[PDB]
Design a protein around this ligand. Structure first.
Ligand SMILES: [Zn+2]
Ligand SMILES: [Zn+2]
Ligand SMILES: [Zn+2]
Lengths: 191, 157, 138, 141, 171
């Protein structure tokens, strides 16, 4: 079943960009379709302080949403059981959206450091740019002054940092490859 | 920019002091230079009216004749004329009029057509890269031939 | 294809292959829009196609998508032969055998160019194409 | 930046200025050339008469209390609310200690001077592994 | 780009010159204070035309300072720079990052980080100049510049251009 790969993918990201404890609750929720609240509680045998945000993260991750699995109490009351409805369609909605968000962000970091164009005065600790440089450039001053401190300017965003963002990208592409490949394998059916 | 969107002071809807509209007033660095002396001579004519109570040799002195007329803190005017005359490739004001009759018959925005005149341009592709706005506005065949007609009007002192 | 599509989106066969995984005419590898657009915007930069160093040129690319780039390059070499022999005298007199012989020569020029195993006529074919271009220009 | 203004008589410029300040006329004048350098001098006298800055410094907290236009449900609501943010600083010991010495010196009739002088001592150290606590009382007494 | 434009101005005529020939003085003030000046909104000013026929309608006296001031609507000649268009010019100044070109009255500068690759600075030239793979750009050399950056400070404009593309460089 492809839905298992979705759950299998959910383990990867919840263990790749999250901790190990983030998958045991993910295991527990997906262990049973309609699982009682206490049954999950006895599995971990720890406090709710180490369990609450894990489900809240998963509900915020939109992979699984706690559903109102209504149960009729036997004591002339109505107390429901907290069974999560694993929201597979929203999983690809949320998780992939971040991947698209981070990749363009790291793409932004690439061209920011790609070539040193903006300038800066270390005395004033303020960045500048070429358009500021030219209007500040003088025939006598072959460099760029800083009228705020009356100091020469220095360049910013040297060529080294462009490699760092690319190396971030290369790690980004490699480390998200198992996530996306397991995500794009779901794109065939959208389940 | 190159999208024919400059400051609103340079739209087609240009307004005189009396509210009347006409297309933008744009001149090439030769046609403008031609109007420079003649208008200034009129002021020098008015200067003397109130006073009563190659091409490089004549370049400076004529401009010096008018540098003497005004305050002269506009020696850049000479420099502009130096920028103009060294780079203005027209003469014989009737040349512009036919060129205006010619270039503006194409329905081109006067800054664009003046840039055709102002730039020593020969080919259609030459205008394809120099003037990005004027690449496909007109068929490039017309470009060269009109430029060649202008290239036929090369007056080289 | 299945896993060779991009330095960024490598497994792009099932990753919504909608972005142009175009091929630079001087790079001959699948480069996704996530990658190529980062490159030609600034100019002739090289792409990290598994650590590749070939230059992705300026805004002068071509469409090659899912047409066996290597064979397409051979087809392009054939197309280059077809372009070099666009005005080649084959049936100027109508002789079919001569055209059959002439067709073999143009294909051999493509064959020399598109093979690369021991390509030495390939450089000569370019000179022959230049000779053809000399015939074509004059 | 260098963020500095220093008056200098342009006509004389003879030195770091030898000038005077006619406070009554609210100006400053070149004592030799007599040119008024800067005018509209601003008073700073009546500002403080209406009015711990020595020890705590820029760590800020404003003493507050109930209002007249307020109910008893508004009175003890504030007295409960005024203590729920005291965690943000560790001057709470100090605000008790500075209170405590204030109780200490005054009770045995020490002069008010010792109140701040003892305050000066505690805020001086306030933290050392040589102290590492140290009964919390020597740091007081 | 070079233009002739119709502009409005506000002269403030100090009371001292209130003689009957103030009209002459008004025409006097305009010319000597404008021709040779610049505006961020309208570029440099070289020449004023139509001297005889300029609107000089009336003068409103200020509340204080008693200096009657006039509104003048006049037509002159101007140069206005922009971005995205090519300008032919004269190389005048230069620095380590590139060279500066005379454009009308404006001294436009061009930087390498926009200039073509094969062109680079070669300090060996006297005067210092830039050798390309095809030519070399010296001071008097006619250079066409496509302006790509210009800032219009009030009464002053400075432009940054490039010679990256074709039909450029030394002419
Ligand atoms: Zn500074
Ligand atoms: Zn990619
Ligand atoms: Zn003095």
């Amino acid at each position: 079943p492809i839905d298992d790969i979705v759950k299998n993918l959910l383990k990867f990201v919840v263990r790749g960009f999250y901790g190990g404890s983030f998958v045991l609750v993910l295991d527990a929720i997906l262990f049973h379709s309609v699982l009682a609240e206490d049954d999950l509680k006895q599995l971990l045998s720890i406090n709710k302080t180490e369990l609450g945000p894990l489900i809240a993260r998963l509900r915020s991750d939109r992979l699984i949403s706690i559903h109102k699995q209504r149960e009729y109490p036997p004591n002339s009351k109505s107390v429901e059981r907290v069974y999560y409805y694993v929201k597979y369609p929203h999983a690809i909605d949320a998780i992939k959206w971040k991947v698209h968000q981070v990749v363009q962000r790291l793409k932004d970091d690439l061209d920011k450091n790609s070539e040193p164009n903006g300038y800066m005065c270390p005395i004033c600790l303020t960045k500048y740019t070429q358009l500021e440089a030219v209007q500040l450039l003088n025939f006598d001053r072959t460099e760029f002054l800083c009228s705020l401190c009356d100091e020469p300017l220095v360049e910013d965003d040297s060529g080294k940092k462009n490699k760092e963002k690319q190396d971030k990208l290369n790690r980004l592409m490699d480390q998200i490859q198992p996530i996306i490949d397991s995500l794009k394998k779901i794109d065939d059916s959208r389940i | 920019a190159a999208t024919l969107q400059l400051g609103q002071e340079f739209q087609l809807k240009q307004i005189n002091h009396q509210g009347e509209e006409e297309e933008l007033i744009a001149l090439n660095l030769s046609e403008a230079r031609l109007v420079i002396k003649e208008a200034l001579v009129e002021r020098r004519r008015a200067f003397k009216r109130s006073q009563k109570k190659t091409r490089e040799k004549e370049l400076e002195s004529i401009d010096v004749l008018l540098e003497q007329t005004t305050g002269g803190n506009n020696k850049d005017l000479k420099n502009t004329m130096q920028y103009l005359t060294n780079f203005s490739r027209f003469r014989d004001q009737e040349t512009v009029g036919a060129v205006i009759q010619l270039l503006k018959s194409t329905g081109l925005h006067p800054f664009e057509v003046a840039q055709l005149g102002s730039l020593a341009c020969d080919t259609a592709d030459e205008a394809k890269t120099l003037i990005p706005s004027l690449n496909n506005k007109i068929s490039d065949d017309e470009l060269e031939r009109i430029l060649k007609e202008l290239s036929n009007l090369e007056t080289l002192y | 294809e299945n896993k060779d599509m991009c330095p960024i989106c490598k497994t792009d066969r099932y990753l919504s292959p909608d972005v142009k995984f175009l091929v630079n005419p001087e790079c001959y590898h699948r480069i996704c829009e996530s990658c190529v657009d980062r490159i030609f915007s600034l100019g002739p930069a090289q792409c990290p196609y598994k650590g590749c160093d070939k230059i992705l040129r300026k805004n002068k690319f071509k469409t090659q998508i899912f047409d066996d780039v290597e064979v397409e390059k051979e087809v392009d070499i054939r197309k280059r032969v077809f372009n070099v022999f666009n005005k080649t005298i084959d049936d100027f007199n109508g002789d079919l055998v001569e055209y059959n012989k002439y067709l073999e020569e143009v294909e051999d020029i493509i064959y020399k160019l598109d093979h690369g195993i021991d390509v030495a006529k390939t450089e000569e074919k370019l000179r022959t194409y230049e000779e053809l271009n000399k015939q074509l220009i004059m | 930046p260098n963020l500095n203004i220093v008056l200098t008589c342009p006509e004389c410029k003879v030195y770091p200025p030898k000038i005077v300040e006619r406070f009554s006329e609210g100006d400053v004048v070149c004592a030799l050339c007599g040119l008024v350098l800067s005018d509209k001098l601003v008073d700073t006298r009546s500002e403080w008469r209406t009015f711990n800055p020595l020890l705590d410094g820029n760590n800020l907290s404003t003493r507050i209390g109930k209002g007249e236009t307020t109910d008893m449900r508004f009175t003890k609501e504030l007295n409960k609310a005024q203590g729920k943010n005291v965690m943000d600083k560790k001057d709470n010991e100090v605000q008790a200690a500075f209170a405590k010495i204030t109780m200490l010196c005054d009770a045995a009739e020490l002069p008010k001077i010792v109140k701040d002088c003892a305050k000066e001592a505690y805020k001086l150290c306030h933290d050392e592994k040589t102290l590492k606590g140290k009964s919390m009382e020597s740091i007081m007494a | 780009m070079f233009f002739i434009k119709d502009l409005s101005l506000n002269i403030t005529l100090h009371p001292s010159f209130f003689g009957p020939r103030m009209k002459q003085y008004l025409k006097t003030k305009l010319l000597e204070e404008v021709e040779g000046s610049c505006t961020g909104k309208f570029g440099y000013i070289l020449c004023v035309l139509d001297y005889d026929n300029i609107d000089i309608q009336r003068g409103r006296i200020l509340p204080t300072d008693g200096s009657a001031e006039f509104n003048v609507k006049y037509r002159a000649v101007v140069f206005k720079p922009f971005k995205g268009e090519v300008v032919d010019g004269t190389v005048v100044s230069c620095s380590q990052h590139g060279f500066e070109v005379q454009v009308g009255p404006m001294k436009v500068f061009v930087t390498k980080h926009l200039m073509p690759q094969d062109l680079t600075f070669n300090a060996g030239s006297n005067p210092p100049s830039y050798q390309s793979s095809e030519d070399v750009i010296t001071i008097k050399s006619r250079i066409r510049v496509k302006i790509e950056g210009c800032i219009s400070q009030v009464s002053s404009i400075h432009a940054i251009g490039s010679i990256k593309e074709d039909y450029l460089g030394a002419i």
